[PDB]
């Protein structure tokens, strides 16, 4: 309404800065939405976690169930597990909400992994945005730790075993300090009365707040420093091509948020996750094949599994094997933020860049990325050895040996293969640059020859063979149908055609609009 706008303008006088941000232009590409999905998942986690906190009770004093689940009546059990069972079974829809929460957390982990992979491939980690990369590494590490703390609050057999093994063994295995850290964390021996409340507090308060603040910082940094863009016809290192905020950008963001909430809700309602009632209350004497915790820290478990048993014995002391696992994970943590410094001091490049490079252009970085992803995949699949041997009748020892040897022998093979693959892609791009794109049509040539009949993409010489073009790092079509050759059939909807004049008018209007857009983009 006019009166409200007039009052708002007269009070705070905001027009300039509002006009400044509202006229901002954002790049348009499908790969640029892989962060919005993670942010929307984060919003879902926050709202669900706000809901779940109203029915939980983190206490380790033993109690009796005497609730509604008959096969669990009259069993000594922890209070927190009783509260979790209450949320799962005695509240209308509570199980649905907690399943949504868990599925959303997995969504968040997968989204952050994919976004980091795309950032690493595009090579936007150069000089202008290195601190963003460091912040992203910190975000990944903190989110992974928070996710590890997630599935441990309902202290069932699975969570209890996982936390016991990981925390107790790693902390107690520290060479110098060792027992001090474990006793500080647990308050004495491993099974403590204060462990679960401390974990609950850390999962609700410190890590989520720090993560939200750091996410806001990252978003602010990407807001101020303008986003990059893929090379194209009307793209240069001193301008940004895209769409404005008001008519497109926010609306697409809201639609994507609704769609991601929809897929989360559907797949949460369809798939059962973490059936703690089928499990039992945690006791030190119960254990089984239940292992392989959540799939975003599964690499640590695989590394623990595959490591050979090397130990050192000197004067009344002993360093166990898992210390090597701790060293490896610490080095992996260290290398993630230190990569841009290593690259910039290795290649000797200190130039600004606002334009990315397509993956096939740079072979070395793609090869190193393939190195890392293959290593991660082989380590992750190693920890799932038991299910491999179960579903597929394979020897457990044979699979363990296969993983052990592959961790060393597979990486160089895929490294060399992807190097050759990138070189071949560059060669194919050069070849399609040299001649016209293949039309897939042959002619008899009555004198007795066969020709491809290349379609030139531009200037043609006196002989009819198109003159060679130049590579500008821009994608080019490899199929005739990618460019406009023959399309836009009749104006009917699904069964009945329309008037011919209307169809012709629509066709000419569309052709004129597309030609005008292309001419405006190319000339400017």
């Amino acid at each position: 309404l006019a009166r409200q706008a007039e009052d708002i303008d007269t009070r705070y006088h905001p027009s300039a800065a509002l006009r400044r941000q509202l006229n901002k232009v954002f790049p348009t590409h499908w790969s640029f939405l892989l962060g919005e999905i993670a942010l929307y998942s984060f919003v879902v986690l926050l709202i669900t976690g706000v809901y779940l906190t109203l029915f939980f009770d983190p206490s380790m004093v033993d109690v009796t169930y005497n609730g509604v689940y008959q096969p669990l009546r009259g069993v000594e059990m922890s209070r927190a597990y009783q509260s979790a069972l209450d949320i799962s079974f005695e509240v209308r829809g509570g199980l649905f909400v907690r399943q949504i929460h868990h599925w959303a957390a997995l969504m968040f982990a997968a989204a952050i992994m994919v976004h980091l992979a795309r950032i690493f491939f595009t090579g936007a980690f150069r000089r202008p945005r290195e601190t963003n990369w460091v912040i992203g590494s910190l975000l990944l590490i903190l989110a992974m730790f928070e996710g590890y703390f997630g599935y441990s609050l309902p202290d069932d057999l699975l969570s209890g075993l996982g936390l016991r093994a990981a925390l107790s063994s790693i902390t107690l295995g520290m060479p110098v300090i060792g027992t001090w850290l474990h006793w500080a964390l647990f308050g004495g021996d491993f099974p403590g009365t204060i462990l679960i409340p401390r974990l609950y507090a850390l999962h609700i308060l410190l890590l989520p707040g720090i993560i939200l603040a750091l996410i806001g910082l990252h978003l602010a940094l990407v807001w101020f420093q303008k986003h990059t863009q893929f090379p194209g016809p009307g793209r240069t290192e001193h301008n940004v091509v895209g769409v404005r905020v008001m008519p497109v950008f926010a609306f697409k963001s809201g639609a994507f948020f609704a769609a991601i909430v929809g897929v989360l809700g559907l797949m949460g309602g369809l798939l059962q996750i973490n059936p703690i009632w089928n499990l039992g209350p945690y006791k030190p004497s119960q254990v089984s094949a239940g292992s392989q915790p959540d799939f975003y820290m599964m690499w640590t478990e695989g590394l623990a599994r595959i490591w050979p048993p090397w130990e050192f014995y000197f004067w009344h002391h002993t360093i166990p094997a898992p210390v090597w696992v701790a060293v490896i994970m610490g080095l992996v943590f260290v290398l993630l933020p230190a990569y841009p410094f290593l690259e910039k001091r290795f290649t000797g490049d200190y130039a600004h860049h606002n334009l990315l490079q397509r993956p096939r252009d740079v072979p070395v970085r793609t090869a190193i990325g393939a190195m890392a992803i293959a290593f991660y995949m082989v380590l992750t699949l190693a920890a799932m050895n038991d299910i491999i041997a179960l579903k597929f009748h394979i020897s457990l020892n044979a699979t363990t040996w296969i993983g052990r040897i592959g961790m060393v022998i597979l990486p160089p093979f895929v490294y060399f293969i992807t190097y050759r693959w990138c070189i071949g892609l560059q060669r194919s791009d050069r070849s399609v640059l040299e001649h016209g794109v293949e039309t897939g049509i042959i002619k008899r040539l009555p004198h007795g020859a066969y020709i491809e009949l290349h379609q030139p993409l531009g200037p043609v010489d006196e002989h009819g063979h198109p003159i060679p073009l130049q590579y500008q790092g821009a994608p080019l079509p490899k199929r005739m149908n990618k460019l406009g050759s023959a399309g836009s059939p009749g104006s009917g909807s699904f069964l009945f055609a329309d008037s011919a004049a209307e169809d012709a008018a629509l066709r000419e209007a569309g052709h004129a609009a597309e030609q005008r857009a292309l001419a405006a983009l190319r000339e400017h």
């Binding site: 023959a486 059939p489 009749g490 699904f494 069964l495």
Partner: protein, 185 residues
């Protein structure tokens, strides 16, 4: 150029191979049929004649509508082609629901796959036919989607025709199987 169409002969030989597949299926069925004397069907089994004939009429009507679609196809009209193909697709979907309901009724009254040899062979013979009908529906969907995304060329008409007589072959093998089972017994 290209007085014959290679798609035609390719589809012809593919349907020939599938016809030999159904020959193998018929070989499985007819075997051991004479091994049982008197009431060679198990008593816990009784075919519903009042429900088998309607699906056969459904399939033959669908085949006739497909032929009408072909007749629309050789001339320059895509919309009548789409209408006839949609009618055929709906008719086939109704048929598929028909044998699904028959399947649900049959197992509910005794005979199952591990129960008797006659039940096993009948189920095996009908299952491949149902799967091929579903594949034909998938082909209908793909072909009708392809029609509305670009211009009309003789290749589209060739694809429509080959799918059409693939459906006709399906109708022929189905009626042969029906005559073998519900009539000769």
């Amino acid at each position: 150029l290209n007085r014959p169409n290679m798609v035609s002969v390719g589809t012809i030989v593919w349907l020939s191979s599938e016809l030999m597949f159904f020959a193998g299926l018929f070989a499985f069925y007819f075997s051991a049929r004479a091994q049982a004397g008197g009431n060679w069907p198990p008593p816990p089994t009784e075919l519903n004649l009042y429900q088998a004939v309607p699906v056969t009429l459904v399939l033959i009507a669908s085949s006739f509508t497909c032929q009408m679609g072909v007749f629309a196809a050789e001339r320059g009209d895509i919309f009548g082609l789409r209408r006839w193909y949609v009618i055929t697709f709906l008719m086939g979907l109704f048929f598929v629901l028909g044998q699904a309901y028959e399947y649900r009724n049959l197992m509910s009254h005794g005979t199952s796959i591990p129960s008797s040899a006659y039940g096993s062979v009948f189920y095996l013979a009908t299952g491949f036919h149902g799967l091929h009908v579903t594949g034909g529906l998938i082909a209908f969907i793909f072909l009708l989607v392809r029609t509305g995304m670009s211009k009309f060329t003789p290749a589209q008409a060739t694809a429509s025709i080959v799918v059409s007589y693939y459906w006709h072959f399906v109708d022929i093998v189905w009626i042969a199987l029906f005559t073998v089972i519900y009539f000769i017994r």
